[PDB]
Design a protein around this ligand. Structure first.
Ligand code: SAM
Ligand code: SF4
Length: 359
């Protein structure tokens, strides 16, 4: 069967057209899928029985299943999401004004950032469209669909889970189109954020095919430090990445002329005042919002979390130059906040297979 979660509205309309139906019936079906979090054609009351019969025969609504769940005391929910044999993560982060979902793009990652727990695993495969938007669907359902509960479950989506989004453009863009779509999750392009370590050629391509909010993962004042922290800097350095960001903003207006800059705080690597000064000079031409993220530790990594006093000094240096700097609050401290810890080692795959036999 065709999984309807793989399709955007354009593709959803043409599918129904081959079924012998008028375009807006696809829109009507999407609405049941995303506004009500429905995966059952029998539950769709305002669709005629004939159309309902065609859909059950050739189509399915199969969302990724939750294999594990962790609820924090601050509201943060973290899920291990099954995608065939392997596992990926999805984190729900509730706030006062916003509700943010962290979605994964790939199974593992090939970019080997030394401060990321997914790096040590290595890359396995990219996710399908259904496997990316189905994280949102599944999260929305469990949290509570908009037209079921009355309140939207998810107001903000950030592609900051496992994987590098820009190395999966073919599946990530259509999935984001569904997030943006009114018959999908009806999100503003300000509320859909793609994070990237800096795959420059792909970033130039992203701007030609969609307009969403960009956030860059910088983590360094210079190229000498970033070669160590973020290996892709060896291929596309900071000034090549910054120049690519300006080219994107000339096409994009989701950022409103100001790119988001992610900057993790690692003990005595990139958190002294001398790094803040260098970073201020670096970005003097590029308008931005700087998010200072405290490093969530995990076993194995050769780094420590930066003391909050050093984070304040670092922040105040940048604020003196006139940069808008945000110190991001840590979420899920009582649980595994570290990105990629719940979905653990690769060898569990075999141990899961023996589990199902004696179930
Ligand atoms: C996991 S990456 C995925 C998207 C993209 N490849 C990127 O690097 O931006 C998203 C963000 O998670 C953050 N991150 C990854 N591992 C972390 C860790 N162990 N502690 C704190 N932040 C982490 C990085 O700063 C990065 O900006
Ligand atoms: S930080 Fe982003 S790019 Fe670097 S390894 Fe982790 S997921 Fe891949």
């Amino acid at each position: 069967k065709i999984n309807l979660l793989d399709l955007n509205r354009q593709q959803m309309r043409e599918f129904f057209k081959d079924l012998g139906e008028k375009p807006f019936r696809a829109d009507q079906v999407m609405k049941w899928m995303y506004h009500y979090c429905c995966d059952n054609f029998d539950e769709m009351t305002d669709i005629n029985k004939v159309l309902r019969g065609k859909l059950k025969e050739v189509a399915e609504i199969r969302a990724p299943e939750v294999v594990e769940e962790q609820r924090s005391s601050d509201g943060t929910i973290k899920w291990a999401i099954a995608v065939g044999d392997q596992r990926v993560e999805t984190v729900y982060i509730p706030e006062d004004d916003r509700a943010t979902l962290a979605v994964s793009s790939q199974v593992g990652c090939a970019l080997e950032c030394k401060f990321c727990s997914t790096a040590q695993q290595g890359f396995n495969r990219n996710l399908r469209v259904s496997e990316i938007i189905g994280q949102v669907w599944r999260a929305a359902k469990i949290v509570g669909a908009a037209k079921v509960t009355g309140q939207r479950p998810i107001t903000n989506v950030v592609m900051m889970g496992m994987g590098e989004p820009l190395l999966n453009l073919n599946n990530v863009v259509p999935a984001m189109e569904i997030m943006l779509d009114d018959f999908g999750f009806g999100l503003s392009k300000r509320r859909v954020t793609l994070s990237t370590s800096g795959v420059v050629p792909a970033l130039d391509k992203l701007g030609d095919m969609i307009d969403v909010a960009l956030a860059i993962s910088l983590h360094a004042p210079n190229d000498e430090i970033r070669d160590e922290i973020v290996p892709i800097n060896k291929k596309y350095n900071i000034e090549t990445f910054l120049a690519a960001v300006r080219r994107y903003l000339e096409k994009s207006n989701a950022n409103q002329g100001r790119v988001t800059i992610e900057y993790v705080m690692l003990d005595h690597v990139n958190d002294g005042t001398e790094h803040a000064h260098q970073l201020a000079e670096l970005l003097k031409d590029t308008p931005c919002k700087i998010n200072l993220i405290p490093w969530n530790p995990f076993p194995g990594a050769p780094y420590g979390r930066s003391s909050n006093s050093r984070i304040d000094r670092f922040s105040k240096v940048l604020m003196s130059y006139g940069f808008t700097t945000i110190v991001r609050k840590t979420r899920g401290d009582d649980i595994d906040a570290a990105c990629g810890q719940l979905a653990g080692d690769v060898i569990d795959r075999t141990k899961r297979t023996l589990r199902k036999r004696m179930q």
